[PDB]
Amino acid sequence: QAPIAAYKPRSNEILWDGYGVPHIYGVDAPSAFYGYGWAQARSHGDNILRLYGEARGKGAEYWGPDYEQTTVWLLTNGVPERAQQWYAQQSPDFRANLDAFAAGINAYAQQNPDDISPEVRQVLPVSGADVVAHAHRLMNFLYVASPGRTLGEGDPGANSWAVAPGKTANGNALLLQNPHLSWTTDYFTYYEAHLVTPDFEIYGATQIGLPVIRFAFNQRMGITNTVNGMVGATNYRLTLQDGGYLYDGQVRPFERRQASYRLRQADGTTVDKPLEIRSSVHGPVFERADGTAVAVRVAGLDRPGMLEQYFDMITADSFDDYEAALARMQVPTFNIVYADREGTINYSFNGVAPKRAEGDIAFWQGLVPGDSSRYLWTETHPLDDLPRVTNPPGGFVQNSNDPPWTPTWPVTYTPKDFPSYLAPQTPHSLRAQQSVRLMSENDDLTLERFMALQLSHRAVMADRTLPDLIPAALIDPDPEVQAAARLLAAWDREFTSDSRAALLFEEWARLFAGQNFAGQAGFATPWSLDKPVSTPYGVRDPKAAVDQLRTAIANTKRKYGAIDRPFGDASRMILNDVNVPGAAGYGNLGSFRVFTWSDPDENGVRTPVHGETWVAMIEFSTPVRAYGLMSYGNSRQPGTTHYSDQIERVSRADFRELLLRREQVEAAVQERTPFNF
């Protein structure tokens, strides 16, 4: 009936387990935030300090030319100054938590100066405003309005499942947390932690430097997030004329402010660099390589409560409380999925979306005319205007970065129900089609079965194409093409370690469906929302596709040494001196569990660039039962034993039991940090 009795910490302490996960106990909220800051500094201090330095707009000053582009970007968009504003605009209670978090980082560094890399020592001390600034950059100027997409590190994404009681064997909701981000990008690094005070408990993962857990659960509830690409910014093409810009048939002068920054020189000194910031009514103005003047208008710059919103969301006493916090509209993007012990599940297409009178998403993603107030939006949508699903007939919600049109099955709304600028109406990826299949087709789910389904690694692309490709390839006069066809034909279409056909198939699909495997032109039957998990299908031009196979055979041998090298011989997961066989692969090929394999080296060996990072599955029984892994461990500091210590388990899908109960934590403790606050 009621959840298990909450633990009431009588002292401030961190209990670290055998994988470097901190269990932070505080007698009050600031105490726990302090412990969390301390813990993050221990595990990720160097990169956190670096990022905080950048978010100050001082990257160029501290570290020179390599950081100057980011400095200019952040200064032009007024990030460091707005962060100071947002910090002052915090509620007193929450500001005290932010101060405590920063104080924890400072205290860790003070007590352990040998653990802080020389280059980032100059960043200390950090402040609550620093914490706010990094979160502001991450959300508004990386996830919403980025200065340009980074290449070769996968596409930010995730899977998410929530399953209602009626669909389970035991009658308890199930939740999957499963974000896909780069394994190397510092600000994308996830960190696992556990916070306990007399008033709340939170367990889960969050990006380093964030003082609140975004992928959180406890004894009552849990959430997860996926990328929805909410269009929270507009790029306006300006018409430059007579020193100003043409707007409503009139020349308007720019707003101008003379900023400047320091740039570190090779000799350790700094040079003062002037920076002229020009702004139109739309926002700050950028000049592009081709000479186009672009004003960037970012929505939700007046929303200082994003950290507190997540905090109130994840500590919510009820779904009603959760929804009230979510409805604040302080979190500018993301699909957010919710489940609780009471049995409620929810999907929300969340973010800060401008209200617009015309134009579809494609129009608002391109360069919008900057010469007219016709296109100058000023208001944003409330939560009630956005796609949301609660306790649907199908008994599950899902999102694998597909447009929000099949979040459950049967669907509860259609694209026509919402303005055309909220989300694309493009073909759902094969991973996303698998996501819907795996949930909808299975009943009476156990946590064990739920976890088994998460490991799915089907080459769905092969299901859609091999029936047509194989017989066409068999009639080719080239005996090697014939042999390749028989190899592909015998394959069980799974991305397993022992698969001898999978690498060849990938190489073919690179041509058939483009380098990202998202191309649609080669299918015989196009994608349809009427058949959302069984289209597109077939090979439109078999003769052409066999020529692609011919080329793919050459490419496979060049990259890997043969057409039949075992998938898990080429695909390895390597961290420090741990080297284990890979399985699963590209989401766009249909693999639900994702490893975006790198290009191979000269030996044909490739490793994940992106994919499974933090993976957790929770059953909201009483007490809750949860399992998880972090691909790249819980620390990235030099000399840590907690970087490469989980990847072998990942290779066998051998998940850790996540320990929330005090007695479990006490049994597992390997290190103790008593602290004073």
Domains in the chain (CATH in brackets) are: 1-45+159-229+299-456+608-668 (3.60.20.10), 46-156 (1.10.439.10), 234-298 (2.30.120.10), 457-607 (1.10.1400.10)
Where in 299-377 does DSSP place strands (E)? 335-340, 345-349, 367-369
Closest CA to 119 of 174, 160, 63: 63
Distance, CA of 321 to CA of 585 (rounded, Å)? 39
> Going by DSSP bridges, is the β-strand pair 595-597/285-287 parallel, antiparallel, or unpaired?
unpaired
Torsion angle of the four alpha carbons 105, 107, 108, 113, in this order, in degrees rounded to the nearest 10? 120
For the chain, counts of helices (H) and of strands (E): 18, 31
- Residue 26 phi, psi (nearest 5): -125, 145
Q: Reply yes or no: is the peptide bond before residue 410 cis, omega within 30 of 0.
A: yes
Give the technique used to solve this structure: X-ray
Distance, CA of 13 to CA of 31 (rounded, Å)? 9
Distance, CA of 21 to CA of 33 (rounded, Å)? 15
Can you read off the two tokens belonging to residue 478?
């080239």
Task: Judge whether 375 and 236 are in contact, CB under 8 Å.
Answer: yes
Can you read off the two tokens belonging to residue 637?
């500091």
CA-based torsion, 318, 319, 320, 323: positive or negative: positive
Task: Judge whether 24 and 193 are in contact, CB under 8 Å.
Answer: yes
Can you read off the two tokens belonging to residue 8?
């009431």
Can you read off the two tokens belonging to residue 499?
């698969």
Give 593's contacts (C-beta < 8 A, 6+ positions apart): 454, 455, 456, 457, 584, 611, 612
Q: Cα–Cα distances in Å, from 199 out to 8, 25, 675?
A: 8, 11, 19
Distance, CA of 303 to CA of 300 (rounded, Å)? 5
Closest CA to 314 of 283, 287, 337: 337
Closest CA to 155 of 462, 635, 594, 593: 594
641: number of Cβ within 10 Å? 12
Which DSSP category does 571 fall into? B
Which DSSP category does 324 fall into? H
Q: Secondary structure of 132-172 in the HEC alphabet?
A: HHHHHHHHHHHHHCCCCCCCCCCCCEEEEEEECHHHECCCC
10: number of Cβ within 10 Å? 9
* Maximum distance among all Cα pairs of the chain, rounded to whole angstroms: 79
**Owner of token pair 């029936």:** 467
Can you read off the two tokens belonging to residue 202?
């939170």
Distance, CA of 359 to CA of 236 (rounded, Å)? 14
CB burial of residue 202 (10 Å; 0-12, 13-18, 19+): buried
Q: Cα–Cα distances in Å, from 470 out to 48, 503, 514?
A: 52, 16, 20
**Owner of token pair 């209200």:** 355
Distance, CA of 160 to CA of 180 (rounded, Å)? 11
- Residue 364 phi, psi (nearest 5): -80, -10
Can you read off the two tokens belonging to residue 266?
């090779």
Query: Which amino acid, 388?
Result: R
Query: Which amino acid, 68?
Result: E
> Going by DSSP bridges, is the β-strand pair 595-597/578-581 parallel, antiparallel, or unpaired?
unpaired
Distance, CA of 603 to CA of 588 (rounded, Å)? 26
Can you read off the two tokens belonging to residue 589?
């090929």
Distance, CA of 95 to CA of 273 (rounded, Å)? 34
Containing 24, the helix (H) or strand (E) segment is strand 22-25
Strand, helix or coil for residue 635: coil
- Residue 204 phi, psi (nearest 5): 150, -160
Q: Cα–Cα distances in Å, from 254 out to 55, 257, 281, 361, 614?
A: 26, 10, 8, 28, 46
CB burial of residue 153 (10 Å; 0-12, 13-18, 19+): middle
Task: Judge whether 181 and 191 are in contact, CB under 8 Å.
Answer: no
Q: To one decimal place, what's the resolution in Å?
A: 2.0
Closest CA to 677 of 131, 6, 24, 49: 24
Give 332's contacts (C-beta < 8 A, 6+ positions apart): 139, 140, 143, 144, 230, 232, 299, 300, 303, 306, 351, 352
Can you read off the two tokens belonging to residue 139?
């959300």
Task: Judge whether 633 and 644 are in contact, CB under 8 Å.
Answer: yes
DSSP for 492-508 reads -SB--TT-SSHHHHHHH
CA-based torsion, 312, 313, 315, 318: positive or negative: positive
**Owner of token pair 């005090």:** 662
HSE on the CB side for 384, CA within 13 Å?
1
> Going by DSSP bridges, is the β-strand pair 335-340/221-226 parallel, antiparallel, or unpaired?
antiparallel
Containing 264, the helix (H) or strand (E) segment is strand 255-264
- Residue 186 phi, psi (nearest 5): -55, -50
Residue 42, Cα to own-chain centre: how many angstroms? Answer: 23
Give 405's contacts (C-beta < 8 A, 6+ positions apart): 411, 414, 415, 423, 425, 428, 529, 532
Closest CA to 166 of 394, 319, 346, 494: 394
Distance, CA of 228 to CA of 431 (rounded, Å)? 15
DSSP for 385-444 reads GS-EEES-TTSEEE-SSS-TT-SSSS-S--GGGS-TTSS--PPPPHHHHHHHHHHHT--S
DSSP for 175-227 reads EEEEEEEESS-GGG-EEEEEEE-SS-EEEEEEETT-SS-SEEE-SSEEEEEE-
Distance, CA of 197 to CA of 587 (rounded, Å)? 39
Distance, CA of 495 to CA of 469 (rounded, Å)? 19
Query: Which amino acid, 305?
Result: G
Give 392's contacts (C-beta < 8 A, 6+ positions apart): 164, 408, 410, 412
CA-based torsion, 395, 451, 158, 566: positive or negative: negative
Q: Where are the alpha helices (DSSP H) in 275-388?
A: 306-314, 319-326, 361-365
Task: Judge whether 224 and 336 are in contact, CB under 8 Å.
Answer: yes
Strand, helix or coil for residue 88: helix
Q: If you compute the radius of gyration of the chain from its CA atoms, what whole number of angstroms results?
A: 26
Which DSSP category does 300 fall into? T
Sheet with strand 250-252: strands edge to edge: 240-241, 244-247, 250-252
Task: Judge whether 294 and 368 are in contact, CB under 8 Å.
Answer: no
Residue 455, Cα to own-chain centre: how many angstroms? Answer: 19
CA-based torsion, 329, 423, 450, 164: positive or negative: positive
Closest CA to 148 of 294, 46, 255: 294
What residues are paired with 525 via a beta bridge?
Answer: 537
Strand, helix or coil for residue 567: helix
Task: Judge whether 242 and 252 are in contact, CB under 8 Å.
Answer: no
Can you read off the two tokens belonging to residue 407?
């979040």
Task: Judge whether 590 and 433 are in contact, CB under 8 Å.
Answer: yes
Q: Reply yes or no: is the peptide bond before residue 403 cis, omega within 30 of 0.
A: no
Containing 112, the helix (H) or strand (E) segment is none
Residues composing the chain: 677
Residue 649, Cα to own-chain centre: how many angstroms? Answer: 22
Query: Which amino acid, 452?
Result: A
HSE on the CB side for 135, CA within 13 Å?
29
Task: Judge whether 47 and 190 are in contact, CB under 8 Å.
Answer: no
Closest CA to 177 of 516, 615, 574: 615
Task: Judge whether 36 and 311 are in contact, CB under 8 Å.
Answer: no
Task: Judge whether 230 and 140 are in contact, CB under 8 Å.
Answer: no
Closest CA to 399 of 357, 363, 432: 432
Distance, CA of 361 to CA of 300 (rounded, Å)? 18
Q: How far does the chain reach from its first CA to its final CA, in angstroms? A: 36
Can you read off the two tokens belonging to residue 553?
């055979």
What are the respective helix, strand and coil percentages of the chain, to the nearest 5?
Answer: 35, 25, 40
Query: Which amino acid, 632?
Result: Y
Q: Where are the alpha helices (DSSP H) in 6-67?
A: 29-55, 59-63
Distance, CA of 349 to CA of 230 (rounded, Å)? 8
Q: Cα–Cα distances in Å, from 121 out to 47, 50, 80?
A: 11, 9, 20
Closest CA to 503 of 561, 434, 445: 561
Distance, CA of 654 to CA of 335 (rounded, Å)? 28
What residues are paired with 428 via a beta bridge?
Answer: none
Distance, CA of 613 to CA of 158 (rounded, Å)? 10
